[PDB]
Amino acid sequence: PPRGKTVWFTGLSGSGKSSVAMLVERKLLEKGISAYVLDGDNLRHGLNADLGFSMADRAENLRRLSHVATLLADCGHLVLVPAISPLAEHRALARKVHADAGIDFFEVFCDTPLQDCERRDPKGLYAKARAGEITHFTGIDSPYQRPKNPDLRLTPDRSIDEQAQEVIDLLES
Amino acid sequence: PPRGKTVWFTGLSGSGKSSVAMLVERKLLEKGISAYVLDGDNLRHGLNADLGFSMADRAENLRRLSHVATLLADCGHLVLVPAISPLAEHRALARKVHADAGIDFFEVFCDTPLQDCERRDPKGLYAKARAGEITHFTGIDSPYQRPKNPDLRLTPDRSIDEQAQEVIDLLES
Ligand SMILES: Nc1ncnc2c1ncn2[C@@H]1O[C@H](COP(=O)(O)OP(=O)(O)O)[C@@H](O)[C@H]1O
Ligand SMILES: Nc1ncnc2c1ncn2[C@@H]1O[C@H](COP(=O)(O)OP(=O)(O)O)[C@@H](O)[C@H]1O
Ligand SMILES: Nc1ncnc2c1ncn2[C@@H]1O[C@H](COP(=O)(O)OS(=O)(=O)O)[C@@H](O)[C@H]1O
Ligand SMILES: Nc1ncnc2c1ncn2[C@@H]1O[C@H](COP(=O)(O)OS(=O)(=O)O)[C@@H](O)[C@H]1O
């Protein structure tokens, strides 16, 4: 097989990481490209069921995710990782795990304003955080460090379909 | 893709787990069957780099490995897991993670006697353990519970090639 590669999505909760990732996955699969979405949230329920949201656990979650991505990539998949990845050092770690495994690594920043993300508020998490029912929530009372150099920055200027198509164009260029 | 399955190898250090697993991988791949080895020792240098050989770390190591296997299996691979898995409960846990994920799970016991494993001694570890330079070494001063009912027991009667073929025959029946 060709060895695979990893697309790592960072951004606020509700910024479109999973949507874009899922759509990219379908588009690729429809053209016989074996793509797989390795979702921070889903893994948190099995492999990463023992971790929370302290910066240390998130780093651990993400460290683990980064390894699993390189493993799926080594099996020949195009891996899509939507995960908040709130700190530069989180992304720097993932990148280094990929460098060390000799797997191509692309960073995509889903740069949707906080306003838009909670105007969306799809799982009700912003509301809970503003109410004090969740704490250390990214963008509210836990920081989000903006990537300075992503491979691609997505903005809420276009449809999810078209955002997926930009990810694909990044991969095919 | 149809869903993959897992072959889980248990046995003493130097009993042939990795050798058989690698050879099974190659044989399968040469026939256009997508196979992948998750080797305990290799992954201890990345995903599981944070774990040692306390019984607790070994359980965690093997818990993690079991989740990764099911996930690669779900992607359609035939997953080969050589790892000592020294306790019955370790194997029972992996089996359950697989049952729960609806992935077929086969247990292979590489039943080479301690004496033979020591007499092989490929990485010098038994010697270090006898000398007191390593502690909690499986079979010397850390236990190995022998599987009561593996799907396949491999014995030092055959070449590694032939042992691989038996694993394959097990899968193809
Ligand atoms: N470019 C876009 N245009 C319109 N709506 C979007 C866009 N990106 C995301 N959305 C909507 O906003 C929400 C983003 O949620 P999701 O992708 O789950 O965010 P995340 O995975 O980053 O937490 C979704 O309901 C999606 O429908
Ligand atoms: N059936 C066999 N016949 C001959 N040699 C074997 C057989 N099984 C294993 N070996 C040898 O014994 C050693 C087992 O090593 P390995 O597969 O690394 O064990 P483990 O992964 O179980 O530690 C290897 O050096 C291999 O050369
Ligand atoms: N305190 C929190 N901050 C951000 N997300 C949270 C928090 N608590 C729960 N979550 C949930 O966990 C998901 C984020 O998971 P990841 O992307 O795996 O997080 S990350 O920070 O470690 O990268 C969010 O989509 C949200 O659904
Ligand atoms: N104390 C030890 N006990 C057993 N194996 C060890 C030990 N220290 C280092 N090793 C090396 O680590 C490998 C064992 O790793 P695992 O298969 O991952 O162990 S397991 O118990 O957690 O299943 C061995 O093949 C050997 O190379």
Residue numbers in the entry:
A (entry chain B), B (entry chain A): 440 to 612
Q: What do the authors of the reporting publication say about this deposited model?
A:
To obtain more insights into the active site of CysC from M. tuberculosis and modes of ligand binding, we co-crystallized CysC in the presence of ADP, APS and Mg2+ and determined the structure of this complex. The overall structure of the CysC protein core and the subunit-subunit interface in the ternary complex CysC•ADP•APS is similar to the structure of the binary complex CysC•ADP. Superimposition of the individual subunits resulted in an rmsd of 0.9 Å. This relatively high value is, however, due to the shift of one loop in response to APS binding. In the ternary complex ADP is bound in a well-defined conformation in the canonical nucleotide binding site in the vicinity of the P-loop and the enzyme-ADP interactions are well preserved compared to the binary complex. We note, however, that in spite of the presence of 2 mM Mg2+ during crystallization no electron density indicating a bound Mg2+ ion is observed in the vicinity of the diphosphate group. The APS adenine ring is sandwiched between Phe492 and Phe576 in a π-stacking arrangement, an interaction conserved in other complexes of APS kinase. The phosphate group interacts with the side chain of Arg483 and the main chain nitrogen atom of Ile523 and the sulfate group forms hydrogen bonds to the side chains of Arg483 and Arg497 and the main chain nitrogen atom of Ser524. However, we observe this shift in position of helix α5 already in the CysC•ADP•APS complex, i.e. in the absence of Mg2+, implying that APS binding rather than binding of the metal ion triggers this structural re-arrangement in CysC.
